[model samples]
Target: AFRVLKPWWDVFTDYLSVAMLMIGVFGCTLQVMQDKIICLPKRVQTVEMKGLKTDLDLQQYSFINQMCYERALHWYAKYFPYLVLIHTLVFMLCSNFWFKFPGSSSKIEHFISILGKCFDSPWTTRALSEVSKKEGEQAKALFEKVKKFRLHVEEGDILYAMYVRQTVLKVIKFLIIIAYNSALVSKVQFTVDCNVDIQDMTGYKNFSCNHTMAHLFSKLSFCYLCFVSIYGLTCLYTLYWLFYRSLREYSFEYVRQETGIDDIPDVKNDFAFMLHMIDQYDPLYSKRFAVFLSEVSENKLKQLNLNNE
Candidate 1:
């Protein structure tokens, strides 16, 4: 029901966001509550003191565990999930915001409402000779509505301006996520060597820390990036389609020719912009609905009304 305004690419991106949100939540649980790293002190052997080795103690291991876990882990290992989660939330808002915005929503709401009314009606004004004749008033009401809306929308480009800007943000944001994710890839890793000086205290100096989370964390990151890559390419095509095609100048020439009630003049600005959007959903809608826009058709309805009274 709410998908009336979304194009194919916008719908596709919405699907991708659902998966991204799921992945982020799964990663977040482990990143927050799970023990992410484990470190063990390397045993040391004496060289000059005839191979005497210091005994490993509970305190030494515990201290080394804390030090390596704190100092060896990279900043990215713990934060990437929240990054994806944040982007996912913001993306859901971008397309939805355009749909419900105060300035643009009412116009779209009315336009769609009229299209539905026209398509659902059994008769067009052109069919008056065989029509119920009582339907003339309904047709007249629709004509008034179409004329009023066309005058109001054609006078300004709010729909076109807001719609185009919405797609621009999507494409740019997708590219940014891809770039930063790839750039930060090398920072987080599975194994890190942490060096410390404890000869005066514990007689040990080096520890090998295993970033247990990085192994799984990087896997999730790679998967997240793949989803983003697919989404970005689709959004690029959406950008191309929006600009390469003439959405602002709509010629109803063929619609006029096929219907044979020729005064369905060419439309431009926000009016054309809306027809193009509707064209994607159902091409037949524009054809069937154009009957209400013809002057000859409107006059025929008026004549029928005049004779009735």
Candidate 2:
């Protein structure tokens, strides 16, 4: 219908076709940028050393840990929308362009391959392997606990990343569509008298109108506005989901439970204590995590812990 009315729409509807085309182009660009950031994992993998024996080796582990820590989050964020966005773009293309492009599902193989790497659970796996080597089946329960916690964290990360991406894409799409609609409304003209057409009413001009499509456009605009408003609020729930399932907060709770620090009312103190334990266990882990958190540091560790003094 829109394509058949393209010429009349070009003059009467303020470049509706062009705007939709631009929107599709922008979606394609976003997909390309997203893919470039998320497709590989081996490139970002950090080496796993047996133990830190010296300041230099410890520092090297610190660097490696820092590098490995956020690659999961970064890759997850970039790759999160692949399935949803691909389907969305397909819908948009079919609706706007009346044709579906090729290779839409072929990307599934690549996406699944990435998924396998993203949840490989290297850190937790290494921990489990080491513990099992030394303790045999005596600590099997601990293995199950670690596995369960890692799975929960992985699930939370995946959900949060997808929710964040959905919220963002909804906002972007809504804004573009609303702006296009606004442009169309602005270009619309009204005529009170047969001889006069005006964009705005003046002091002497009659408030009455006789544009035949006025009712149609007004209803369309109202519906568009209503949908955008509803969609924005709907995305607010996802933002809440993103924060509520945060992996960092999940780890904090796990640390508190494992370390028997749940009675501590002070979150910062408890968190610092947890970091200290992690530091003692994995020398590189402490510095990398401290730097990332930006709240606890080597100097602050002393103040946070009396033993450090």
Candidate 3:
């Protein structure tokens, strides 16, 4: 009789084992991307405004700052709450409520112990491989796009800050992976009801007779599902947050330093950068003024170059 139920139990528990493994891998991937996605608008606005060559005149400068600031604000205001919501879901999915169970063939403690083993066991690898491939592809594309943008840094200010924010995100990415694997080690050992995974299993090996192990297992499996789903969502939100912070901080500093636009966000404090932009992009002021200055100084080469008219 119990033997008949054993097959069904095996099928059900096996499915759960795979599910839990998927949760950890997927969650970490999503957590890494949250900042980047949120910051996209800020990055785009920074480059766009910078390209406009506002160093020519104060009015043009203020207008450029105002437009970029408003655009960035609209984007951040619209998306920040969604980012927070996903993070809250992540915390919930990984909580302890998923491990508790009553009225099963095993105790809650025993139930969790047995079910935990699947996370590291061979069963986990299958789900993890598929999800990992997809996550890797998405992550690669994101970082590549970031790299494609011209940084246009000088004096190491904006560059240094951008490097720090990106490095932090990278560190978080690696840490999440390590944490996921660590979390799995204990979870998989308990799920299978096999050998006590540890070197010393003396008093800790049995499922609780008071609760059905099946029910506890079912609950744990659900927890794993939620955890993985949250991971996928977290990756997206955090990426946006990182991107936004970088652009806003850099741009705001630049604006304050250059134009005394203290209230503006996402400006870099870079006089050198402003000068460079004027030299590179201002058609009328930069080139024409340079020609006038050269003729005034009576420099033969510069005078000839300007008079090449």
- Cα lDDT tens digits for candidate 3, 1-309: 122212222233334434544444444444344322111111121355435221224543333333333342223222323333453343333321222213222322332232233222332233223323443333333323222221322223552243334435433643563455345424322122212222142222221111122233334434643543444344345345435444322222332343322332232433222323333333223222222112222233234335553
lDDT of 2 by residue, 36-74 (tens): 211111112199778422323444433333333333223
Superposed model 3: Cα runs more than 4 Å off: 1-211, 214-218, 244-266, 269-309
**Order the candidates by TM-score, highest first — what do you get?**
1, 2, 3
Candidate 1, residues 17-99, lDDT tens digits: the string is 99999999998998888745666656656566675455767777777766776666666776889898999998888867668
Pairwise lDDT winner, candidates 1 and 2: 1
Give lDDT: candidate 2, residue 8.
27
Top candidate by lDDT: 1
Worst ten in a row by lDDT for model 2: 36-45
Return the TM-score for each candidate structure.
Answer: 0.87, 0.29, 0.20
* Ranked by lDDT, top first: 1, 2, 3
Q: Which scores better on TM-score, 2 or 3?
A: 2
lDDT of each: 0.78, 0.34, 0.32
lDDT of 2 at 5: 18
